[PDB]
Amino acid sequence: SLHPRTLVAAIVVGLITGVLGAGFKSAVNNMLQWRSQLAQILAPIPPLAWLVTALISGGMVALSFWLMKRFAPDTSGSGIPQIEGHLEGKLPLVWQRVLPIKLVGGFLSLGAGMLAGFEGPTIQMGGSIGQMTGGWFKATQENQRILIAVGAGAGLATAFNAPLAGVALIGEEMHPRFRSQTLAYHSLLFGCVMATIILRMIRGQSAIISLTEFKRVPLDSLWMFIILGILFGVMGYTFNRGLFKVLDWFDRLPPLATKWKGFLLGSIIGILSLFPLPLTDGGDNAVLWAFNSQSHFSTLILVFCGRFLLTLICYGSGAIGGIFAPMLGIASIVSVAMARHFHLLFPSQIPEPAVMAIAGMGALVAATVRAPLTAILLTIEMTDNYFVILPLLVTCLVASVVAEALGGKPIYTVLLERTLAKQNR
């Protein structure tokens, strides 16, 4: 049921988003540590670095919002909604505006230390690339939907080095028609594999955090994850309800408050980046902090509360964000602390407290997004671990069932409804 010209077209897509997605992370992290290095050169005398790192990170986030509007307010926030909508009819996609602004803007946002979120810019930039190439390749109407849907999944793979995830993204959440070329899967796979290959060439080839050795997970240890699910289920429910309210508060003007909204929220995050803790930035560092570097059970709770608020305060403000990675650090910090405690009560059933630290790593995403299958893979692909599956599933799907048992609604569909409601911006 497959058609050649398109497959080779997806090969072009994944290749572009790979170079841009990988090239993006490197460019951002270089700016991240450059500020951190500027903070220690001025650190000695005195808190002059307290000022300089505030003017920089503040001016970066401020110039981030200004380049958003007026230029292309379509880049605000995540990236899944804007493409999830275009793929379905509502909301237009223009690449010559999204591509060069979601990039030059997203860089100033993530580069200042905001609580996001590579998979944000890369997924939209990738969808735009899928359109840019679709126009270059003069493909049909249904085929150019595929190229954009491919560039979307590739954008995810190019952020977490996870192909199967970017594939399962389109497959579960953001479910498209594809009529009747249901073999656009082939176009996806192609687009993703190529993306991660270009990724692994620039900064590969290993995963995000390979916890490959932990493989002792007994059968009578699963009951704990039902509870790890219920915990993350209500966690997702409160994450959504909160985000929505922070969005409201930000939507409520005033005209002079938004003038400074960027400079303020940015400089405040600029200071918070100076404290030796993973309380700011994308969220990868926060996952590389639950595990492995052992810290106080109190400090976990300290950072968990720190980020859980700062992400909502960040994304709600409507900066060029990305909500996947932040929900990975927030979830991991918890799952690790929950891990310690369950091993504390029952060590005879959780011999390795890292198993439960992996299972509930993408359980927040699973709950808030209603999309467990695409979360379960995301974890497997950044830990190279599959032995954690039976836990992973139960703690990810029970995490979703519960959140929508309290009635939370998929954070992206509701995030889309709100971006639709700006049919006059």
Structure tokens at 67: 């380049």
Q: Which is nearer to a second copy, 15 or 330 (CB)?
A: 15
Identify what 167 binds: Br ion, a second copy, none; CB under 5 to 8 Å per kind.
Answer: a second copy
Identify what 322 binds: a second copy, Br ion, none; CB under 5 to 8 Å per kind.
Answer: Br ion
Q: How far are the Cα atoms of 72, 211, 235, 263, 362 from residue 357, in angstroms, in the given order?
A: 40, 10, 16, 37, 10
The piece of 58-66, 182-190, 249-257, 317-325 that touches Br ion (CB under 5 A) is 317-325
Identify what 380 binds: Br ion, a second copy, none; CB under 5 to 8 Å per kind.
Answer: a second copy
Q: Which residues contact 47 (CB under 8 A, 6 or more apart)?
A: none
Cβ of residue 67: shortest distance to a second copy, in angstroms? 35
Residue 78 engages Br ion in binding (rule: CB under 5 A) = yes
Identify what 235 binds: a second copy, Br ion, none; CB under 5 to 8 Å per kind.
Answer: none
Decide: helix, strand or coil at residue 359.
Answer: helix
> In whole angstroms, what is the distance from residue 231 CA to residue 76 CA?
30
Cβ of residue 411: shortest distance to a second copy, in angstroms? 13
Q: How far are the Cα atoms of 67, 70, 163, 165, 188 from residue 168, in angstroms, in the given order?
A: 32, 34, 9, 5, 10
- Cα-only R_g, the chain: 21
Number of residues that bind a second copy (CB under 8 A): 49
* Residues 365, 162 contacting (CB under 8 angstroms): no
> In whole angstroms, what is the distance from residue 289 CA to residue 209 CA?
11
| Of the candidate residues 55, 227, 301, 405, the single one contacting a second copy (CB under 8 A) | 405
Residue 324 engages Br ion in binding (rule: CB under 5 A) = yes
For tokens 């450059």, name the residue.
34
**φ, ψ at 320 (rounded to 5°):** -60, 95
Identify what 78 binds: Br ion, a second copy, none; CB under 5 to 8 Å per kind.
Answer: Br ion
**φ, ψ at 199 (rounded to 5°):** -65, -55
Identify what 384 binds: a second copy, Br ion, none; CB under 5 to 8 Å per kind.
Answer: a second copy
| Of the candidate residues 13, 68, 164, 350, the single one contacting a second copy (CB under 8 A) | 164
Structure tokens at 106: 């997203």
- Which candidate, 71, 170, 83, places its Cα nearest to that of 131? 83
For tokens 């030059």, name the residue.
104
Residue 18 engages a second copy in binding (rule: CB under 8 A) = no
Burial of 296 (0-12, 13-18, 19+ CB in 10 A): exposed
Residue 27 engages a second copy in binding (rule: CB under 8 A) = no
- Per-position x/- string for 189-208, each x denoting binding to a second copy as judged by CB under 8 A, each - no binding: xx-xx--xx--xx--xx---
Cβ of residue 152: shortest distance to a second copy, in angstroms? 16
| Of the candidate residues 347, 384, 417, 425, the single one contacting a second copy (CB under 8 A) | 384
Q: Which residues contact 58 (CB under 8 A, 6 or more apart)?
A: 112, 262, 263, 264, 266, 267, 268, 270
The piece of 43-51, 75-83, 297-305, 395-403 that touches a second copy (CB under 8 A) is 395-403
Identify what 370 binds: a second copy, Br ion, none; CB under 5 to 8 Å per kind.
Answer: a second copy
Residue 322 engages Br ion in binding (rule: CB under 5 A) = yes
Residue 172 engages a second copy in binding (rule: CB under 8 A) = yes
DSSP code string of 114-129: -S--THHHHHHHHHHH
Residues lying near a second copy in the complex (CB under 8 A)? 1-2, 4, 7, 163-164, 167, 171-172, 175, 182-183, 185-186, 189-190, 192-193, 196-197, 200-201, 204-205, 212, 215, 219, 222, 370, 372-373, 376-377, 380-381, 384-387, 389-390, 393-394, 397, 400-401, 404-405, 410
